Structures are given as structure tokens and as C-alpha cells.
Amino acid sequence: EISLSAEFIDRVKASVKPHWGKLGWVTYKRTYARWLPEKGRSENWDETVKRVVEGNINLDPRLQDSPSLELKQSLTEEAERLYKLIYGLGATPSGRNLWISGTDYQRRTGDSLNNCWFVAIRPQKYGDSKIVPSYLGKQEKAVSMPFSFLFDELMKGGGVGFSVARSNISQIPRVDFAIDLQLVVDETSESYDASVKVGAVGKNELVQDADSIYYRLPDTREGWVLANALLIDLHFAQTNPDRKQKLILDLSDIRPYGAEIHGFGGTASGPMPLISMLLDVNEVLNNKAGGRLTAVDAADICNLIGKAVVAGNAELALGSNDDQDFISMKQDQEKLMHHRWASNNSVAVDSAFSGYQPIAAGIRENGEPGIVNLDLSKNYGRIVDGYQAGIDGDVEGTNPCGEISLANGEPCNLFEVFPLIAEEQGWDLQEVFALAARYAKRVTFSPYDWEISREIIQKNRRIGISMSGIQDWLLTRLGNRVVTGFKDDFDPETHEAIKVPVYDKRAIKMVDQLYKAVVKADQDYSKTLGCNESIKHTTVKPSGTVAKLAGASEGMHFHYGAYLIQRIRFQDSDPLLPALKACGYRTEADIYTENTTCVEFPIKAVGADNPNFASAGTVSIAEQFATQAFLQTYWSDNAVSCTITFQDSEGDQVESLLRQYRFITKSTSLLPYFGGSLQQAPKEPIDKETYEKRSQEITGNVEEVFSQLNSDVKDLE
């Protein structure tokens, strides 16, 4: 087993200073630092990175076949470089990886290293997977399969994109039987009352007869999935020969709310959310008994499921562009508040499509729907590499953030690099992206629970090396924004006069070399391992949380402002508050949430004093489209995630721009530049003078003060 020595760590810590953003360390402490029962304290940065790096390196498949002494030392040195890179924050894996990589939970939980997936909502076989209904054969198709997949990955903390295109919904058979459902929660359970409140009946009130179908739920994630799978499959004759229409699900064993759970810092929700979900999911199905399920019904069930996972504390529905019922489903206020908020909805289009008029109207109202061009996604890598028939022919959708082109049951597999920071930390970018590629490649050899995922991954070995802090990197290195201006031109088909962007040709070369570096890295590593080369390699994700660790601009997004006071909200009991107060940070009771404290962090954006500096509120919608297009053309062979924000005075341009880029954009997400005016803004803009004054008030090092207090005060955490 490859590992890093204490001697090496201390050396890195001695020469490498983590490039924390003004909110970085704090964000790390309350987000990725796991609790150490042995030591009675949460992890320190160096420790987290150690287990993350070790957890990834030990995935290399060669280490499974009597690894040679040379092999193990080479991997050890690669791990040491990896540790130095991540520790310095010049690059990092996904937030999920930072939280679970190298942990006991990870090693005992399949799919634990991937945070997003895609699945088509059409009857499918469960195949030889960890979860398989008892009443189902392996190769036997079931209506519940896609829902079970989504339910499972969602409970494992991931996000799931799914397709309810008309083509899939039509594959779902007529709802043959309206099922009578009773949810039992024994009077003895510590969740009895609470459950009765949501519709469950005591063991006494239970009305049973010999013909009823009965299932005792094991107090496990699988128990939850199988119970919803049973409920669904009983509505269809194909998976219910006995025509039994009496189901009794017993959730007396489900652990109560607050109960300790494996794989999360949080606790259990109790069976209550599961009860409601099963009851509501049954209604949607019963309400169509003898009829047919629509995309709205299919999406509602997925939404109800997502809602049950969120519980009392992550989806993307992709449908047909002509399905008006689906497109309008989230506008129903009552149902939006009850569960349709669970997913963000988009429609599938192709380059031939031009019906953007109604789509634009929707977008100008609520920012929905989003768009996914399956045509371009299946026939293109980077747009510059031109049309390539079926290069990604198995693509059927994308993940919730929409940066990865995905096939049915396929997961996202990301790694984020911050070009500006890596360079400032003395790294050669070409080498950074190569380490990135290999990290991702290894994740593809981790344990996966679903057969369909194993197969597709074996064939694709897809990786998604993301580039973040893009605006900081370009403004600094170029002195201006990738889009230097616009020149006149005409639409390639309609000859319509339009404004095309002029890109800084310097940017093309720098991103192109990095792309080729990831491809070379993947080609060589694929040879060494003897597996398939990654079908795709790059993308852009606006990973907010991780970008905060390093204080980098998120994905390709622009900064909210040059100089700002950023407010971070903490529970009044949070261990970090005394340390922050001791360091000079200004605090105030939060007016939007009870028992919460706001802490003010003065922040200066890179290039704040550059006349080419652009704040998100001032960047034209036309320029945002051009910027996304640039990255999709010369960098990402997957997609480009970014929220294009516009002022109402720009709404007249939404339909026009969507049409203009119909031959380049794989997916689009627009949102009316809201804001209005918040009395206690999470991001308040200030002038340079105010920023300097405020930052001078902070003369204490929170990381050091926290450790000191933690030491002098017992049970601070």
C-alpha cells in the first residue's frame, strides 16, 4: 500500500504555504475536515490531503498484481508530487473526494468517489448489481430500475441528471394496477408519533389479510430503494403476475431522526420523509391507473424521491422541447413548493432547432428551462476539432451542473486546476494537468455497484479535468478579457447580420497546450495500464466551495465585484467563532436565520485595479456567451458549465444569442441577473479605500488562533 511518510509531509509543510483564499481555511474546517475520535479533534489541512492522496494512489490497478519494487516507488513519488500540488491548493480533486477519499467509509462503499450521474427514465434491467429486487430476474426489465438508480446515487450524496424525453416515457407501460398502500411503524418505534403524522399506521390500526404483500424494510439505504422499487413494480402486470394490489411496507426498523449514519457528517432523517415519498409516489402512479405515465409524472416521482433524500435539511430533468406539460411543470406554484423544486429542468435540442421564442420567454421569467444539445454533444469533442460522427455516440444527457456529456448510468469524474495559482506555486502547468489526468483515470478503477456503470466506464474511462479561476488567470496573464471585442458578420445559414466576438489569440494557445497535455498524459497512462483511452478529457465546472478554498474565480465566472465584504454565516455555537472574533473580524447577528452569526471577510479580487476588470453585473450577455463558446471551442471536449446572467434590459437578446450559438453550445443555463437589494448582502461591494481599512482590522491568523484556543480550552469542538 502506497503511503506518504511523516518526514516527507513535514518537509512539504516547511517549504509550501497553502494558497488559502480569504475564506479558504474557514471553509475547509467546516466542510472537508473529518472528525478524529481518537484525537478528539477535526483534521488539519496537511492530514486531509494525506488521506486524499493516499486514497487515490492506492487505486492504481497494477498494485493489485504483485507490484514490483520500482512500481511502488514510482507511485510513491507521484503521490508526493500530488500531495505537494494539492496541499498548495494549485489544484484539487472534487469536494466529495476531499471529504471521503482515503476513508473507511469510502473503502466500504461503492460509487463513493463520483458525485454526479445520468440515467434514462425508461424500463431497464437491474443486471448483476448490488441492488436487485427479489421478485426480479437479473436480465428482467423493470419500470422501477431507473428510479432505483437515481434513489441510490442520491442517497449516496450525489447529484443525478435524468431523461424523461418523450422517447423514454413512451417506453413505460400502462399503469395496470392501483395499489392499496399501508405504511407500518410500530407503536414501539422512537419514530411512531412522527410517522403517524405523515400517514403511517400503528401495528394496531393495520388492516391486513392473507393476500396482502408484506415487506419488512432492513434499516439500510438498500432497504429504502427496494421498498420504493417494490411499490412501483406492483403497478405493472409485467412485474406482478398475481395481480396483487395490496401492499404493506413495514418501516418499524428504520432508525430515528438524528441517528448516526455512515458516510456523512450529518445524521439520519427518520422514516418520516420516506413515508410521505411512498404515499405521494403511489398517488402519482394510482392517479394514472389504467392510463399512461407522462414526463411530468415521471419527473414528479424523481422529484419526490429527491425531496425525501434532502429530508428536513441535486437533480436535472431533461425532457423534449415540444413537451409543453413538462416545460411548464415548475410554474405550478403549489407543486413547485411541494416538490418540483427538487430538480432543474431543461430541454433537448439539436442545431436544426430554432424554436427559441417560447424557451426565451420562460428563461426571462425564472431562468428555466435550460438547454442541452445532444446533437453537438454526441458528434463533437472540442468544437475546433470539428464534426466527428458518433465520437460520443452513447451520450443521452448530462449531470445537474451540465458540464459533462454522459451516457446512461455513467458518472462524472472531475479534478479542478487553478492555472494562476499553480503557476504562482512554482508549477509547470503541463505537469499539473498530467497529474490531474492520472488522478481521475485512477478513480475509474474504483468499485462500482451498478452493472451498467461498470460497463460504460470500462468502455469510456471518461475523465473531466476542469479549469477554474479562469478569469483571474486570463486577466493577469493577458491584461484583458479573452473577448477583446466584436466584429460584424452574418449567420452561416440565414445570412443574418450578427456581432461575432474577437478572441485574444494568445488565449487559444495557452488553453490548447493544456488540453493536449491532458490527452498525452491519458494516452501514455492508458498504455501503461492497458485500458481504454478516455473518450473525453476536459470540462469547466463553476465549483463554488472548492474555489473558495483557494480564493479563485469560479470556473469561467467573473467576480461579483472588485472589492467586497463577503459574509459567511455560522451557527452561534460554532467552535470557529471565538477564534474569528479574536482575530478582528466584524460580526453581527444574521437577520435571515435564527441563532446564526454573520462574519465579514474583506476580499480583493485579482486584477481589481485593472481597467479590463469586469464584475459579473457589468459583463454583457453577448460577451458571456462568447466566453463560454471560446472554452467549448478550444478547451473542453465535454461541456462548459456556467450560468449566464443578464439584466432585464438584455432579455431582448436571449433568443437571439441562443440562436447565434446553436452550432457551438452543448448546454446552456441562463438566469435573470437578480439581486434587487439585500439589507444584509452576502456580498457587499466596497471601494479600495474601505477594503484596505477593513483588512487592516484583521491582524490575527485564524488558523493559529483556533489551534491555540482549542489547546487551552477543552472540548472547544
Curated annotation (Swiss-Prot):
Name the cofactor(s): adenosylcob(III)alamin
Full protein name: Adenosylcobalamin-dependent ribonucleoside-triphosphate reductase
Disulfide-bonded cysteines = C116-C412
- For the region Adenosylcobalamin-binding-2, what residue ranges are annotated? 678-717
Q: Which InterPro entries match?
A: RdRp_reductase_class-2, RNR-II_ins_dom, RNR_alpha_hel, RTP_Rdtase_AdoCbl-dep
Gene encoding the protein = rtpR
How is the protein's activity regulated, according to its record? Allosterically regulated by ATP and dNTP.
Q: What is its EC number?
A: 1.17.4.2
Matching entries from PANTHER family are given as: RIBONUCLEOSIDE-DIPHOSPHATE REDUCTASE, VITAMIN B12-DEPENDENT RIBONUCLEOTIDE REDUCTASE
What GO terms in the biological process aspect are recorded for it?
DNA replication
The molecular function GO annotations come to: cobalamin binding; nucleotide binding; ribonucleoside-diphosphate reductase activity, thioredoxin disulfide as acceptor; ribonucleoside-triphosphate reductase (thioredoxin) activity
Give TM regions.
none
Q: Which domain of life does the protein's organism represent?
A: Bacteria
The residues annotated as the active site are C401, E403
The ranges of region (Effector region-1) come to 144-155
State the family named in the UniProt similarity comment for this chain: Belongs to the class II ribonucleoside-triphosphate reductase family.
Q: How does it assemble?
A: Monomer.
Region called Adenosylcobalamin-binding-1, residue ranges: 558-619
